[PDB]
């Protein structure tokens, strides 16, 4: 805290906050398309599997923007997690778009903590984005859209058949 | 038998040996199954496999059962096994619809024993139960649940196709 | 979903969306917990992984409950996690004494589900909750109370260096 | 040097060769704090042991930079290394605050040195900082603010205990 | 028995009845000592192994002297074992002057029975208590006076500071 604290805005503080919450919710949807997909009466495993590696994923993403926050002598403050926007998330085509969004959305607000960061000259932080957070960012939305085009292309008129075979096929399962 | 029994009442006796007898006449009608898709004009493997291996699991419970029997002191009684419903099996559709019927009409003889057992307070058998039947249970109908999902989400307008992609892409197989 | 359930009530199937959302938010708390003793004012590293191992504890209680709810076939609901009912923590004896708070409330809402499961004569939750939950609660809630003795005998008129000698000679650290 | 360098200014070359001096001066003084504990009426050798490390910490980036303005076509040119500011050290507090005032100024020196490479649009000299030296002074200051705050701790109304615990029980010794 | 039964005397049989009786007596005093230092308001974990261990220990010596008497020919016969002498143990100070009083009895009631065996010129009796009981009592009670002068420098003004010291730095726990 004020022992350590050197070149750390109170804007960049707050903004860390909240980037917190974000990664958190964004772990809290994962966590909830995989349980859809572990449904009875929908049953993919691989998209299960997908979207629950994701949810761990944003958790340490999470965690690490707090040891950060600790590391320069900010403070974290905890918000509610909202709720996610979906109960139920429809077929895997639909969840892919729900998590490209979330994940644009995600790589939106690291950009513009960057942008706060290069306008406070505080390159420790805008480091810890490059380093830690904006290419991990590029290359899931990278997988994502790949997974999409992949998932577009077998729809055909054989919509449940695509479905089946892009889980089986690209996802991983057991 | 009369020097151990010990809290062991006469109607939990013979639900048990009832039991015995659901068992294996499930794992007799798993034997058909498992030998109806072996059949040259069904030819799938997979399919074989899951219900041979079911067979076994339902032989297994009534010798725990058995065995429990005696534990407790209590005398096993044999009846004819019935025969299977069908002879012939349909599609793997229709036997796994088959199969999830069986599977409930199980768990509702385990859960009707249960219930005797704690009217009757007899904690072992309901401990015996939950430790080796209800959950391996749970878990087998969610699976065939998980199945029959995944085989109507192919028949589509090809199921001769999706029958086999099934079979080859989620059972298990040589 | 409805092609699985069986002898499992609406009642159940929404307490255990409780209870999911009780964990997620006691797995919130103890991430808020964990980063405060990291924080470099206060700077104890024992009490920070003392409680950020729980967080990840309770996540995984949840998890389960999540799991079952579809094994029985049950939905999966979601509500918002509320932030954590402090924002600083105090010393080790606060937080320790909030964290038995905490465990003691999960603990009874174990209890009350399963009073509610023995109700509706499901066995099934009956036992998944004393086989997983139960004595988990019972021997976290007993390490919890042999620290809190060793920490109030610590206090002495020399409350900084017990802290110390707590965190150093009985927590787990590098 | 000048069939080499490229996009690098008059100004980050004397620049780097100053904070070259910087780090070598960093280095003395914690030479000379590491052999003040080693004297037979301090006696910590934690605290010897841990000072000592940090005079090769800051010689390492001394020749880190001079590796560096090499690379670039540079020449490095060194000046006096100033005696350390005291020649005794006082207790383990004075010594751990004293080092973090020495830690911020270093950081001070990466800080300005890299907004100079950013006024210079020279993107090497920056990101060389962040990747080898800007996250090494946050993590450092951050655990000599941790110890800090358990030094201060231990005081008490026993000093003198609390600065043998906090040798025996924190910093590395044999 | 009869057929056996060489130089050894009516007395000495009855005799080593007695101390089978005094060390089962004193496992059991170990036995409370142990779980009462397990309890969460008492808290000492190292106390706990200390006294539990030494209900073993006091059990195997009883045994010891169990099969001697068959070897010799004698007629174990036992008596009730009176509960020990407290509920609760106090302070581990406390605890340690109460064993330490019971294991001065039990060594007395050694010499008492080697005595009578000298005067009975039973040399195998004597050569008994020589080899396996008096230096295992005296080097038990030496242990047992270390710590107690242990125990005793650590109270100072801050007794629960050094019963907490004593178990962390001198008993054995995890
Ligand atoms: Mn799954
Ligand atoms: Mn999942
Ligand atoms: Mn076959
Ligand atoms: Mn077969
Ligand atoms: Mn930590
Ligand atoms: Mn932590
Ligand atoms: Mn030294
Ligand atoms: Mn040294
Ligand atoms: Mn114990
Ligand atoms: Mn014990």
Redesign the interface.
């Known amino acids: 805290?004020?022992?350590?604290r050197?070149?750390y805005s109170t804007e960049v503080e707050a903004a860390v906050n909240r980037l917190v919450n974000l990664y958190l919710r964004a772990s809290?949807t994962y966590?909830?398309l995989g349980?859809?997909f572990?449904?009875?009466?929908?049953?993919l495993?691989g998209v299960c599997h997908f979207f629950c590696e994701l949810a761990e994923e944003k958790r340490e993403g999470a965690?690490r923007l707090?040891?950060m926050?600790?590391?320069?002598?900010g403070?974290?403050?905890?918000?509610?997690?909202?709720?996610?926007s979906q109960?139920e998330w429809g077929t895997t085509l639909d969840a892919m778009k729900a998590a490209i969004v979330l994940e644009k959305s995600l790589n939106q607000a690291l950009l513009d903590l960057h942008a706060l960061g290069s306008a406070q000259?505080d390159?420790?932080l805008?480091?810890?984005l490059e380093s830690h957070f904006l290419d991990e960012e590029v290359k899931l939305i990278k997988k994502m859209g790949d997974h999409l085009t992949n998932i577009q292309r077998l729809v055909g008129?054989?919509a449940?058949?695509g479905?089946?075979?892009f889980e089986?096929?690209t996802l991983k399962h057991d």
Chains 1, 2, 3, 4, 5 share one sequence.
């Open positions: 805290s004020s022992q350590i050197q070149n809290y966590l909830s349980f859809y572990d449904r009875d009466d929908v049953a495993e965690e707090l040891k926050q600790n590391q320069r002598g403070r974290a403050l905890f918000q509610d997690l909202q709720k996610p109960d000259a390159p420790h805008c480091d810890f008129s054989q449940g058949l479905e089946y075979l089986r096929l």
